[PDB]
Structure 1
């Protein structure tokens, strides 16, 4: 049967067991595909979707084995035999096809409900590149051929939108644990491997337990598994020590042999120090803080009948976590497919986005899930934070010292534990350490800074606020019922609230409005919203302690917690006054950009590996659709050699933080944070060192680049754009940029290549083909399509500017708008044609929604040597009707290249009427 609707068609395939399939035209280039064994297409209401104003017109043709739906941009074909869908572009060129017979549905019976675990396979060629699907920690730029599980965790963020080099995007509308690649996930070591111990006896590896390097006991183990709290009960009791000094060690040693040949993948999930050798070669060498283990993946080509040695070396403190897990190759018929799997839902439901560019793929995500709210302009200046300022004098003193040193600072952050110890969730202030919070806020504001404060979803059962939420049915009960104690003092019972209902959101915000917003705080730091009820619980317990919610089970809704949670604060803060909202959330999700939510990569560590990993994490985050993203400059948690401030390791501490500070100055939000040692510029290193010189320079350069940066921020809303750009976005025809994991573009102009090795004074940098490049620090010109050894002394990061870039700049400022009516300096990097439409607005309220913004077109014609400043369009409260515009040309080596106050070459008065500036 074929049934036509006003917005698409439903096909009931003739083959036995093939599911009915429905197509809906959302817009000319956006097609919804739903497949449901029952044929009714009933699902829980989508959380990520917003309505779309689109052209839903289409034509139908029915020919033989297929039904064709045609829009102005797409032809979608449906098999009448098995229902499989294939998409072609306007010219009939194939873009993406489902696998015929490529759907899977399996029953899942949990929490009194019935769900389907669903899988869709698509045909995928060897040369397809894939990006997005959230923000992850393997250092993978390209996701092709990789296995990636969406499971909200401290440092691992789920957003189910994927982008392809084949000119499409896919939104997978499911809120449960989800898998790209292998639908099975990671297996215990012996499931598809034969094991031999250190004496060659089959069936186990040899495990040895030690305290302070002294052997305690040895035993055979067929699994390497202390992954979660429930697994720790098997750790040998005589091998445990809780001394403040003392450490523990475990080794596993033996050999593995596979049962089927091919590419095998692995994860060493670990905290504290962990090494792994295969065939004598070191393949994992990692440190994380004991309470935040994560996956460290590797892969090997292996064939049956051949043994390979394995040696795991773990050095830990109580408690720490480890697991060695494995995936064997999929069947050949499946192994090359693009596969998407979800644990719980009602049907397969996804959206095909036709995309002539990577930019258009991101724009389709914003159409489907919401435009990205504008953030306040001050959010794009420098943020200073600490875990934690322990008194209001410490916080205010940090602001005062930035001002005394004339460094640039816009925003200061107050972390957790400002409340009385036994009153988490009251939002009260301990008067010993915060005697006058209203005065704290006023003192910060009087120094022209904004203040953000930590608010968790966490409540102690003794607080009035807990009891209010609980009496209304909006407190998860299990964590308090089992008596789980947190880490504060002697340990406190606690739980987290249920954000899914609008009544819960109203209560949560009302408590915060009365206690905190009334005091003038500017921004909300919405931490731990995975939610992180008790760290390192197994997944069954995380689910049980967050269920039921107002809509259903935490199995159906495992990844969606931050969306309603941040929504409630966004709506309440926006209703309370006319200023723009700012939220920093530890997790994003599909749609969170519509609630004025920036995100960060979580409690990563002060390690060069983690720094490097954030480059590909940030690029994939932007291609997933979330444009306001940051990290802790220098890392969150630190090894003992850094916390104890061992002078032997001070040079590396300073060099890591300096390189990471250079990098942070060129990501969407610029923010210093972390655990002790203190992270303010002068506490990293004193004035006189190259570290201080470097941090001060990039701190001030950021303020001069604000006109450029904020124009990009305007276009995250106006043009559904991004700020951090993968190199493939602007060079989609250069295959060499598809897999490079340590370079990116900061807007259209700046190629950024952070230095991630101790003692490096240079690094290799690949310059994309098709453009020439100007070295920011010197003006030296380099042709595209080459790798160079770029100079990188401790104090400077490799930075190159694309020929034809127009970069609006201003004077160095200690805070946003310090100098009112500042002159604008347009810097033109010559060598090709270019254009840049400068967006400006009041930076403060929602007037831009009603058209209160201006655009000044800037056009550079390389043949003529002419910068055209076009007619201004639009106006806003506080706009400069007449203004000074300086112009500076960089066409090659120049002595003041990269200077904070460089020489200008022309200066004109602009009143909105078009004006031309010639280089000759």
Structure 2
């Protein structure tokens, strides 16, 4: 095996510096910004790759001018505003320090880059206290330190608590030393975080180029901001995607869709999306509504739409050979992935429809061809897709025959991990082309880094297939799977609520596990119940107790829509997931590295779902601050401690941070059932002299105008001083979208005692009964008054949403 060895010279080309080392080897450092360094180590010095990055869309992160290199007798030095770089000459070693000269990131000995006949590896010093997070949608504990992980998009049904690899490959990790690494290679990469030795960690590939990006941040938020500068801002879903969604393996019929739609509405269980699974289509993959299964598909979609339901349909990436018309068409056009042994279309087995052709979404002409096929259901009013089985399915590491696949852009060993990625990109591109100024809904199984530009995600076929009742630990692991997916830029994520696997032979016995799965599930952005085949898992199937609890779980998510939607926008702007590992908000608190049983939803809410069988309590770690029970709003706790709370079956432990302001809407059966509604702001005043706020984001929820910053925002501020609370409703920040109106705001200030008076500006407001404050809340927009509820300990202040600044002063 070959190392860089001694560096004899350097050359600068603008923001790029190339160091020449032993036997034609070279290494480039490229300053994308003061914080982000592109590093390319090359065994032969040529700096070419078979394919340019599929993930990186921007390398200019604002670096100005040339890289300045200072030569010393035994080292070279490069300074940026945030970094100090030391390059040892003999032998080549790269070391990166922060501006205070603390070491962040160092090559291990002489083995910083290792080449062995095309196998490429990077070895880095591993510090005793260095922890690691990320690598996308992967199982096990949040903290990756001590374990090894592989990138090979795999199809592992009913996967275990530690199964790896899974369906997606996002080679972006973060270190507790406050940098991220994105290893910009699509082959079967492997990451070993001290799993081989305590002295070093490594990342490697069997082929391709050693190209990786070092992304410094002063915290994890900055690292993620740097990552989306490189790989793109997340697209937002249509607003209605943040409701509740329902699926089943057999959701492939008009009669059943009509039956289920009616049942949801009759039982007043809110729901926005009815999915259809893969059997909806006449064959793989013609996008024709199966004739026996749908009498009037247009009518169905419209009738469901009139009831507030949107429909999302499945697609697989293959054409069945039995689908003779489409297969022959595809094969004759050269649109199928080839077999290098024959030069002909690769002959792929598939679990349904017989052997198939794998559609080559890396071939440019395939895009418009697929686009025209997939548009058919969209012309009937379907709102998007779930793209399943793009690993491709049935192509795990041991299925070595797949390596014979030859795609337009390369061989399968290179293209496997971007097969689904390039498919998903086509789906979204073609959607944009044929459906003007509309947000796509796409939710995918297989993916690569950068997916956030095109698609959302779900965690595939989870749960226990031998006995559905034994899936508790698998359900529990969906917490860190989802948080890790979030850190890998899947902010719009869900899992199969109930799991995918296991026949439900006894609905009474399954009720507890279902209820807990849904309680967790409603705090995932794309909350979707689904199950294999004919195993019905709608929220009323588990008896009345479970139904009532599940209705309430779902109702809580709907009430929180304006809160959640504000964080959906924040995902677009900053890359931060809605579901946040506590470490993202409390990076200095090392206890957060251990937390696999709880998470933040945005910044204000801490959710700690019960995921243990028979449990009626929950252990919860509270980070810095003070924390209030969001269910009752009365019980308060000090931060930086472990507590145990009562958590019976009907209860989700949720806490609100003291100081928070939470926008909410009334219960509705689907998003926008009421196109205009009063917005309540639940305000939990912070400590004396501490100003807090929430910026309530709104936009049209459907178009791409938000990508051009067409929206409005309303900032609500709270600040307590001596026997006084000031609540400010900020002047509406108008950027080309006017909110639904006219409407009222209700400021709901949580307080121990009824105050003396409440003022709006200089003017004293009228105290009235709760009933009077509530009267004509959706019809009269001229009343400004306040009320007290002693039972709830809440001051309500009614005020029209005029769009103007208003200062509400509460005299304690």
C-alpha separation in 2, matches of 1:434 and 1:384: 19
Deviates further, 563-572 or 471-480: 471-480
Is 1:634 the counterpart of 2:491? The answer is no
C-alpha separation in 2, matches of 1:760 and 1:898: 34
How big is each residue's C-alpha offset from its partner over 1:774-831, in whole Å with a ceiling of 9 and x where there is no partner? Answer: 0112220011122222111111111111111211111111111212321111111234
Shift of 1:725: 0.4
Is 1:166 the counterpart of 2:166? The answer is no
Pairs within 5 Å for 1:395-434? 395-420=257-282, 423-434=283-294
The aligned counterpart of 2:438 is: 579
The aligned counterpart of 2:188 is: 177
* Contact 1:580/1:846 (8 A) holds in 2: yes
Change (3 A) 1:753 1:4: same
Where do 5+ consecutive residues of structure 1 fail to align?
109-115, 184-328
Shift of 1:557: 2.4
C-alpha separation in 2, matches of 1:714 and 1:169: 23
The aligned counterpart of 1:659 is: 516
Change (3 A) 1:564 1:32: same
Shift of 1:129: 1.6
- 3-state SS of 2:414 partner: coil
Change (3 A) 1:18 1:860: farther
* Contact 1:889/1:919 (8 A) holds in 2: no
C-alpha separation in 1, matches of 2:413 and 2:750: 57
* Contact 1:853/1:876 (8 A) holds in 2: yes
Of 102, 105, 116, which residue of structure 2 is paired with 1:93?
102
Change (3 A) 1:434 1:706: same
Is 1:918 the counterpart of 2:809? The answer is yes
C-alpha separation in 2, matches of 1:700 and 1:611: 22
Pairs within 5 Å for 1:820-899? 820-832=675-687, 833=690, 834-863=692-721, 865-880=725-740, 883-891=743-751
How big is each residue's C-alpha offset from its partner over 1:606-660, in whole Å with a ceiling of 9 and x where there is no partner? Answer: 4001111111111111112221111000100115xx2x33xxxx44300000001
C-alpha separation in 1, matches of 2:281 and 2:456: 25
Shift of 1:84: 1.9
Is 1:60 the counterpart of 2:69? The answer is yes
C-alpha separation in 2, matches of 1:477 and 1:24: 37
Pairs within 5 Å for 1:324-403? 330=196, 334-345=197-208, 347-403=209-265
The aligned counterpart of 1:219 is: none
Is 1:9 the counterpart of 2:17? The answer is yes
* Contact 1:12/1:80 (8 A) holds in 2: no
Change (3 A) 1:338 1:916: farther
* Contact 1:781/1:893 (8 A) holds in 2: no
Shift of 1:104: 4.5
Of 789, 798, 803, which residue of structure 2 is paired with 1:907?
798
Change (3 A) 1:353 1:398: same
* Contact 2:726/2:808 (8 A) holds in 1: yes
The aligned counterpart of 2:112 is: 103
Shift of 1:704: 0.8
Change (3 A) 1:133 1:437: same
C-alpha separation in 1, matches of 2:313 and 2:346: 30
- 3-state SS of 1:710 partner: helix
* Contact 2:74/2:88 (8 A) holds in 1: yes
Shift of 1:910: 3.2
Is 1:39 the counterpart of 2:45? The answer is yes
How big is each residue's C-alpha offset from its partner over 1:886-915, in whole Å with a ceiling of 9 and x where there is no partner? Answer: 111235799xx999x996611212322222
Pairs within 5 Å for 1:194-213? none
* Contact 1:18/1:82 (8 A) holds in 2: no
C-alpha separation in 1, matches of 2:705 and 2:308: 23
How big is each residue's C-alpha offset from its partner over 1:365-392, in whole Å with a ceiling of 9 and x where there is no partner? Answer: 1111111112111111111111122420
The aligned counterpart of 2:761 is: none
The aligned counterpart of 1:668 is: 525
- 3-state SS of 1:500 partner: coil
Is 1:806 the counterpart of 2:806? The answer is no
How big is each residue's C-alpha offset from its partner over 1:17-74, in whole Å with a ceiling of 9 and x where there is no partner? Answer: 6941111111221111111021121123111110244322343322222222222222
Deviates further, 457-466 or 738-747: 457-466
The aligned counterpart of 1:610 is: 474
The aligned counterpart of 1:692 is: 547
- 3-state SS of 2:268 partner: coil
C-alpha separation in 2, matches of 1:682 and 1:593: 34
C-alpha separation in 2, matches of 1:550 and 1:600: 28
C-alpha separation in 1, matches of 2:541 and 2:85: 60
Change (3 A) 1:881 1:485: closer
Is 1:152 the counterpart of 2:153? The answer is yes
* Contact 1:391/1:433 (8 A) holds in 2: yes
The aligned counterpart of 1:733 is: 588
- 3-state SS of 1:11 partner: strand
C-alpha separation in 1, matches of 2:337 and 2:223: 38
Is 1:516 the counterpart of 2:377? The answer is yes
C-alpha separation in 1, matches of 2:710 and 2:172: 31
* Contact 1:145/1:336 (8 A) holds in 2: no
C-alpha separation in 1, matches of 2:47 and 2:284: 44
The aligned counterpart of 2:142 is: 141
The aligned counterpart of 2:556 is: 701
Is 1:78 the counterpart of 2:87? The answer is yes
The aligned counterpart of 1:469 is: 330
Deviates further, 50-59 or 575-584: 50-59
C-alpha separation in 1, matches of 2:642 and 2:490: 31
- 3-state SS of 1:555 partner: helix
C-alpha separation in 2, matches of 1:618 and 1:455: 23
How big is each residue's C-alpha offset from its partner over 1:705-746, in whole Å with a ceiling of 9 and x where there is no partner? Answer: 000000001111123332110011111122211112111111
Shift of 1:152: 0.9
- 3-state SS of 1:389 partner: coil
Shift of 1:424: 2.3
What is the aligned residue count? 740
* Contact 1:881/1:912 (8 A) holds in 2: no
The aligned counterpart of 2:540 is: 682
* Contact 2:57/2:232 (8 A) holds in 1: yes
C-alpha separation in 2, matches of 1:169 and 1:893: 48
Shift of 1:536: 6.1
* Contact 1:774/1:892 (8 A) holds in 2: no
